Design a protein around this motif. Structure first.
Motif, PDB file in Angstrom:
ATOM      1  N   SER A  97      51.388  55.953 -20.105  1.00 47.72           N
ATOM      2  CA  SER A  97      50.820  56.293 -18.845  1.00 47.72           C
ATOM      3  C   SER A  97      51.603  57.411 -18.140  1.00 47.72           C
ATOM      4  CB  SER A  97      50.649  55.015 -17.979  1.00 47.72           C
ATOM      5  OG  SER A  97      51.852  54.434 -17.627  1.00 47.72           O
ATOM      6  N   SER A 138      43.085  51.529 -15.664  1.00 49.50           N
ATOM      7  CA  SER A 138      42.602  50.147 -15.827  1.00 49.50           C
ATOM      8  C   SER A 138      43.777  49.186 -15.581  1.00 49.50           C
ATOM      9  CB  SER A 138      41.973  49.995 -17.205  1.00 49.50           C
ATOM     10  OG  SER A 138      42.901  50.010 -18.243  1.00 49.50           O
ATOM     11  N   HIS A 189      45.711  50.764 -19.186  1.00 49.62           N
ATOM     12  CA  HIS A 189      45.594  52.093 -19.721  1.00 49.62           C
ATOM     13  C   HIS A 189      45.340  53.090 -18.582  1.00 49.62           C
ATOM     14  CE1 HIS A 189      44.994  55.204 -22.625  1.00 49.62           C
ATOM     15  NE2 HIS A 189      43.686  55.246 -22.513  1.00 49.62           N
ATOM     16  N   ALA A 190      45.626  54.387 -18.854  1.00 52.08           N
ATOM     17  CA  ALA A 190      45.465  55.438 -17.898  1.00 52.08           C
ATOM     18  C   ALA A 190      44.806  56.654 -18.537  1.00 52.08           C
ATOM     19  CB  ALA A 190      46.839  55.851 -17.334  1.00 52.08           C
ATOM     20  N   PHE A 207      51.120  54.551  -7.502  1.00 51.93           N
ATOM     21  CA  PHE A 207      51.356  54.301  -8.934  1.00 51.93           C
ATOM     22  C   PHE A 207      52.784  54.584  -9.389  1.00 51.93           C
ATOM     23  CE2 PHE A 207      51.587  55.866 -13.295  1.00 51.93           C
ATOM     24  CZ  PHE A 207      51.030  54.850 -14.022  1.00 51.93           C
ATOM     25  N   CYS A 252      54.957  51.780  -8.220  1.00 49.22           N
ATOM     26  CA  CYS A 252      54.789  50.636  -9.139  1.00 49.22           C
ATOM     27  C   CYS A 252      55.460  50.903 -10.459  1.00 49.22           C
ATOM     28  CB  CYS A 252      53.313  50.314  -9.337  1.00 49.22           C
ATOM     29  SG  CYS A 252      52.534  49.605  -7.882  1.00 49.22           S
ATOM     30  N   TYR A 268      44.352  48.819  -4.254  1.00 49.85           N
ATOM     31  CA  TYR A 268      45.355  48.705  -5.355  1.00 49.85           C
ATOM     32  C   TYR A 268      45.805  47.293  -5.533  1.00 49.85           C
ATOM     33  CZ  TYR A 268      48.705  51.055  -8.539  1.00 49.85           C
ATOM     34  OH  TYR A 268      49.401  51.505  -9.627  1.00 49.85           O
ATOM     35  N   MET A 278      46.985  45.425  -7.989  1.00 54.51           N
ATOM     36  CA  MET A 278      48.210  45.157  -8.778  1.00 54.51           C
ATOM     37  C   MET A 278      49.435  45.557  -7.947  1.00 54.51           C
ATOM     38  SD  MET A 278      47.453  46.080 -12.804  1.00 54.51           S
ATOM     39  CE  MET A 278      46.614  47.561 -12.399  1.00 54.51           C
ATOM     40  N   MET A 323      45.832  36.137 -12.139  1.00 55.35           N
ATOM     41  CA  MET A 323      47.058  35.812 -12.900  1.00 55.35           C
ATOM     42  C   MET A 323      48.311  35.856 -12.041  1.00 55.35           C
ATOM     43  SD  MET A 323      46.747  35.008 -16.190  1.00 55.35           S
ATOM     44  CE  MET A 323      45.647  35.369 -17.567  1.00 55.35           C
ATOM     45  N   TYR A 324      48.402  36.824 -11.129  1.00 48.49           N
ATOM     46  CA  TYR A 324      49.560  36.895 -10.228  1.00 48.49           C
ATOM     47  C   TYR A 324      49.670  35.653  -9.342  1.00 48.49           C
ATOM     48  CZ  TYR A 324      51.064  41.859 -10.348  1.00 48.49           C
ATOM     49  OH  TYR A 324      51.593  43.075 -10.654  1.00 48.49           O
ATOM     50  N   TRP A 375      44.047  29.988 -12.735  1.00 44.27           N
ATOM     51  CA  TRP A 375      43.695  30.251 -14.104  1.00 44.27           C
ATOM     52  C   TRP A 375      42.249  30.013 -14.478  1.00 44.27           C
ATOM     53  CZ3 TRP A 375      48.695  27.251 -14.967  1.00 44.27           C
ATOM     54  CH2 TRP A 375      49.806  28.184 -15.082  1.00 44.27           C
ATOM     55  N   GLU A 387      48.261  37.257 -22.801  1.00 41.15           N
ATOM     56  CA  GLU A 387      48.447  36.511 -21.574  1.00 41.15           C
ATOM     57  C   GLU A 387      47.640  35.194 -21.611  1.00 41.15           C
ATOM     58  OE1 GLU A 387      50.392  39.671 -18.944  1.00 41.15           O
ATOM     59  OE2 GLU A 387      50.519  37.441 -18.962  1.00 41.15           O
TER      60      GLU A 387
HETATM   61  C1  LIG Z   1      52.751  50.775 -13.180  1.00 44.00           C
HETATM   62  C2  LIG Z   1      52.477  51.159 -14.629  1.00 44.00           C
HETATM   63  C3  LIG Z   1      53.307  52.373 -15.173  1.00 44.00           C
HETATM   64  N1  LIG Z   1      52.614  49.958 -15.454  1.00 44.00           N
HETATM   65  C4  LIG Z   1      51.667  49.546 -16.230  1.00 44.00           C
HETATM   66  O1  LIG Z   1      51.821  48.613 -17.068  1.00 44.00           O
HETATM   67  C5  LIG Z   1      50.317  50.185 -16.275  1.00 44.00           C
HETATM   68  C6  LIG Z   1      50.005  51.304 -17.048  1.00 44.00           C
HETATM   69  C7  LIG Z   1      48.640  51.717 -17.052  1.00 44.00           C
HETATM   70  F1  LIG Z   1      48.318  52.784 -17.766  1.00 44.00           F
HETATM   71  C8  LIG Z   1      47.632  51.085 -16.272  1.00 44.00           C
HETATM   72  C9  LIG Z   1      47.949  49.929 -15.587  1.00 44.00           C
HETATM   73  C10 LIG Z   1      49.237  49.493 -15.538  1.00 44.00           C
HETATM   74  O2  LIG Z   1      49.557  48.390 -14.851  1.00 44.00           O
HETATM   75  C11 LIG Z   1      49.954  48.440 -13.526  1.00 44.00           C
HETATM   76  C12 LIG Z   1      49.589  49.472 -12.703  1.00 44.00           C
HETATM   77  N2  LIG Z   1      49.982  49.464 -11.388  1.00 44.00           N
HETATM   78  C13 LIG Z   1      50.699  48.499 -10.939  1.00 44.00           C
HETATM   79  N3  LIG Z   1      51.087  47.494 -11.673  1.00 44.00           N
HETATM   80  C14 LIG Z   1      50.727  47.380 -12.968  1.00 44.00           C
HETATM   81  N4  LIG Z   1      51.098  46.264 -13.669  1.00 44.00           N
HETATM   82  C15 LIG Z   1      51.704  45.055 -13.183  1.00 44.00           C
HETATM   83  C16 LIG Z   1      51.386  44.445 -14.570  1.00 44.00           C
HETATM   84  C17 LIG Z   1      52.642  44.065 -15.343  1.00 44.00           C
HETATM   85  C18 LIG Z   1      53.335  42.827 -14.789  1.00 44.00           C
HETATM   86  N5  LIG Z   1      52.385  41.629 -14.676  1.00 44.00           N
HETATM   87  C19 LIG Z   1      53.199  40.554 -14.051  1.00 44.00           C
HETATM   88  C20 LIG Z   1      52.335  39.234 -13.987  1.00 44.00           C
HETATM   89  C21 LIG Z   1      53.129  38.122 -13.393  1.00 44.00           C
HETATM   90  C22 LIG Z   1      52.449  36.736 -13.376  1.00 44.00           C
HETATM   91  C23 LIG Z   1      51.766  36.348 -14.702  1.00 44.00           C
HETATM   92  N6  LIG Z   1      50.988  35.140 -14.388  1.00 44.00           N
HETATM   93  S1  LIG Z   1      50.986  34.025 -15.530  1.00 44.00           S
HETATM   94  C24 LIG Z   1      50.653  34.620 -17.029  1.00 44.00           C
HETATM   95  O3  LIG Z   1      52.328  33.481 -15.577  1.00 44.00           O
HETATM   96  O4  LIG Z   1      50.154  32.930 -15.107  1.00 44.00           O
HETATM   97  C25 LIG Z   1      50.882  37.530 -15.167  1.00 44.00           C
HETATM   98  C26 LIG Z   1      51.710  38.837 -15.321  1.00 44.00           C
HETATM   99  C27 LIG Z   1      51.169  41.984 -13.903  1.00 44.00           C
HETATM  100  C28 LIG Z   1      50.449  43.224 -14.474  1.00 44.00           C
HETATM  101  C29 LIG Z   1      50.795  45.770 -15.048  1.00 44.00           C
HETATM  102  C30 LIG Z   1      53.955  49.335 -15.518  1.00 44.00           C
HETATM  103  C31 LIG Z   1      53.953  47.889 -14.918  1.00 44.00           C
HETATM  104  C32 LIG Z   1      54.519  49.391 -16.909  1.00 44.00           C
END
Ligand SMILES: CC(C)N(C(=O)c1cc(F)ccc1Oc1cncnc1N1CC2(CCN(C[C@H]3CC[C@H](NS(C)(=O)=O)CC3)CC2)C1)C(C)C
Length: 462
Positions: free
Chosen positions: A141, A164, A167-168, A224, A227, A262, A264, A308-309, A327, A349
């Motif tokens: 990304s 998404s 993905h970006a 972004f 994040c 936003y 996430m 999920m969060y 869930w 997940e």
């Molecule tokens: C910010 C971006 C560079 N990140 C992405 O993974 C990302 C990349 C993309 F192209 C498109 C989307 C992308 O995701 C995000 C874009 N903007 C903000 N946050 C994002 N993410 C947070 C994310 C990772 C961490 N999990 C944490 C979460 C905690 C609780 C858990 N609940 S459970 C499974 O225990 O019940 C589910 C996972 C949530 C989703 C992905 C980083 C986190 C590596």
């Protein structure tokens, strides 16, 4: 080079100084993505290293790497000179402030051909323009973001980042109507660079969110990069400074209205607040709920992570009923997708939740219930939430090109069903939505759980 009002904020000598710089840039119609990503990457690069009175400070030390204008200006000039030198805008006619696909591809290619040939795709701290300029390395990304920053440097005001949940890519043209893949996705897949995202939307994969993905404006692109801050120094340890920086920046964006669309980012802020609450601010639950509301308002309630969060928060806090409800809601969103060959992250997940998280949580509840010899294990709505979770997973599988369920899911289903007594299970009155669950509706509520019959049904070809 930088404008005058950008220079007066330097040098940056603390976290608050970085925050002030973001506040200034976010007050403009075009926050400078290059400048801001360079600053974050510089600060990350130097903070994400491991490093009678006590001989050494007894609580350790906090650090800040002072960021001099001369250093940041030079990196900025190197990026802007490289992009401006490589793209001749007179060769790409540009009426109406809409870029052509050819121009977008050229800028994309300039970024892509600049990168080092070999490095681990999952390497930490290669998300920013700092990494691109100083190490010619960008994660998946980060490539998309750098394409957008390069477009901004060329004055292409219509090119924006699309995201998404995994993905970006970029969007451009009259209404954000055009799309182009600019980066890779996952490992060992074949690349689609230069293609539209239409095949992915049509396939109803989670990866393209059925078209309900994020189309950023410049302020969301800032959100972004915030994040994308990665506080990890190693597997078992985080920079407190980088957690604080990300947290303060997300509150700044929140106050300005820039996390409204936003989900996430709101989850990320909730998680940070749980770790270290900020006096006077909304609690984590309020923020998780705001992220779900955002997904419902703007994205057709077609996102998975908002729920999920929330589920994660409830799970960590031993709120068994609430976690299961959340869930159940995640499954209610996923059931309207098809499981496709690059959706592996969300498969992982669901797998983990079904085969590790739920079983641990229900085991904890069972120990509590034993010790007390009401419990969530005595609550039919808890049982109904467990069933809705599986029912949505079965329905997700229906019509998908890849199967989801297999024998490895069956033992944990049976064990989790068994955590609820027959008399509790028999109180429920539900009509399932998946063929798979309908075909075992009697087994799921019978006093004696017939494991092998449940296994056969769960693993039947859909
Ligand atoms: C910010 C971006 C560079 N990140 C992405 O993974 C990302 C990349 C993309 F192209 C498109 C989307 C992308 O995701 C995000 C874009 N903007 C903000 N946050 C994002 N993410 C947070 C994310 C990772 C961490 N999990 C944490 C979460 C905690 C609780 C858990 N609940 S459970 C499974 O225990 O019940 C589910 C996972 C949530 C989703 C992905 C980083 C986190 C590596």
């Amino acid at each position: 080079g930088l404008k005058t009002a950008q220079k007066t904020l330097f040098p940056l000598r603390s976290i608050d100084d970085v925050v002030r710089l973001f506040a200034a840039e976010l007050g403009r119609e075009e926050p400078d993505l290059v400048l801001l990503s360079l600053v974050l990457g510089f600060v990350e690069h130097f903070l994400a290293v491991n490093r009678s009175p006590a001989p050494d400070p007894p609580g350790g030390l906090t650090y800040f790497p002072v960021a001099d204008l001369s250093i940041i200006a030079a990196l900025y000039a190197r990026f802007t000179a490289q992009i401006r030198g490589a793209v001749d805008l007179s060769l790409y006619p540009r009426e109406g402030g809409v870029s052509s696909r050819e121009l977008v591809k050229k800028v994309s290619d300039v970024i892509w051909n600049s990168l080092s040939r070999s490095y681990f795709k999952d390497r930490a701290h290669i998300q920013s323009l700092f990494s691109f300029i100083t190490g010619t390395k960008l994660d998946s990304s980060g490539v998309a973001f750098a394409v957008v920053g390069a477009c901004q440097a060329l004055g292409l005001r219509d090119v924006h980042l699309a995201l998404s949940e995994d993905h970006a890519w970029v969007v451009f043209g009259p209404n954000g109507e055009q799309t182009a893949e600019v980066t890779w996705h996952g490992k060992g897949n074949e690349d689609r660079r230069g293609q539209t995202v239409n095949a992915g939307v049509a396939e109803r994969s989670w990866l393209y969110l059925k078209g309900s993905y994020m189309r950023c404006d410049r302020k969301m692109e800032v959100a972004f990069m915030v994040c994308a801050i990665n506080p990890s120094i190693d597997l078992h340890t985080d920079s407190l400074e980088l957690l604080q920086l990300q947290q303060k920046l997300l509150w700044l964006l929140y106050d300005l209205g820039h996390l409204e669309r936003y989900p996430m980012a709101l989850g990320n802020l909730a998680d940070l607040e749980e770790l270290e609450p900020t006096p006077g601010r909304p609690d984590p639950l309020t923020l998780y709920h705001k992220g779900i509301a955002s997904a419902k308002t703007y994205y057709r309630d077609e996102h998975i992570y908002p729920y999920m969060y929330l589920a994660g928060y409830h799970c960590r806090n031993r709120n068994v009923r609430e976690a299961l409800q959340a869930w159940a809601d995640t499954a209610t969103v996923i059931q309207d997708y098809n499981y496709c060959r690059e959706d592996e992250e969300i498969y992982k997940e669901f797998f983990e939740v079904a085969n590790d998280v739920i079983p641990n949580l229900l085991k904890e509840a069972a120990s509590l219930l034993e010790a007390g010899e009401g419990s969530a294990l005595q609550d039919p709505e808890c049982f109904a939430h467990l069933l809705r979770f599986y029912d949505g997973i079965c329905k997700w599988e229906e019509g998908s090109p890849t199967p989801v369920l297999h024998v490895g899911w069956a033992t944990f289903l049976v064990q989790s069903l068994g955590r609820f007594e027959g008399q509790v299970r028999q109180k429920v009155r539900i009509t399932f939505q998946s063929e798979k669950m309908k075909g075992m509706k009697e087994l799921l509520v019978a006093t004696k759980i017939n494991s092998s019959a449940i296994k056969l049904q769960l693993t039947a070809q859909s």
